[PDB]
Write a protein that binds this ligand. Sequence first.
Ligand SMILES: OC[C@H]1O[C@@H](S[C@@H]2O[C@H](CO)[C@@H](O)[C@H](O)[C@H]2O)[C@H](O)[C@@H](n2cc(-c3ccccc3F)nn2)[C@H]1O
Length: 138
Amino acid sequence: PLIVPYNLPLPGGVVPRMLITILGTVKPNANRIALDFQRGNDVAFHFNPRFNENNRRVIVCNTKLDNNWGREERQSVFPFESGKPFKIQVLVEPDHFKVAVNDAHLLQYNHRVKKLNEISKLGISGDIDLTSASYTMI
Ligand SMILES: OC[C@H]1O[C@@H](S[C@@H]2O[C@H](CO)[C@@H](O)[C@H](O)[C@H]2O)[C@H](O)[C@@H](n2cc(-c3ccccc3F)nn2)[C@H]1O
């Protein structure tokens, strides 16, 4: 029952072995969700489930630098369902973010922003009831 959009500070940025967990429930008739791992105004890793892009469900990932989006990476495996509880786990690995949803691997996103210790905030937005957002080292 956290307020959305939600800003989770990531003190000292991210680092390999850091696991970020987001628990929530998708709203009925959801349109979109976004996680934005931010380095100041830049978005190192945007993770964006879209429930209706041309009547298809797709996950779009990208990076925003100096207010410009780059090349999208798209994943049609789509583990979310309107109305249902989810867990997103984002594990920082040395050369990529590794994302699992509901304990099943979903995608990896290679690091474009390389100053990992400056990726100091996670924004959580869109059509969810947000239960919790936290991090730990594994
Ligand atoms: O690349 C990734 C970006 O994509 C564009 S749309 C893109 O536009 C291109 C140019 O026309 C096309 O070339 C390309 O096909 C098409 O995907 C989105 O607006 C961006 N966004 C989403 C959101 C957001 C806000 C609130 C809640 C959830 C959210 F997700 N805030 N910003 C971002 O997701």
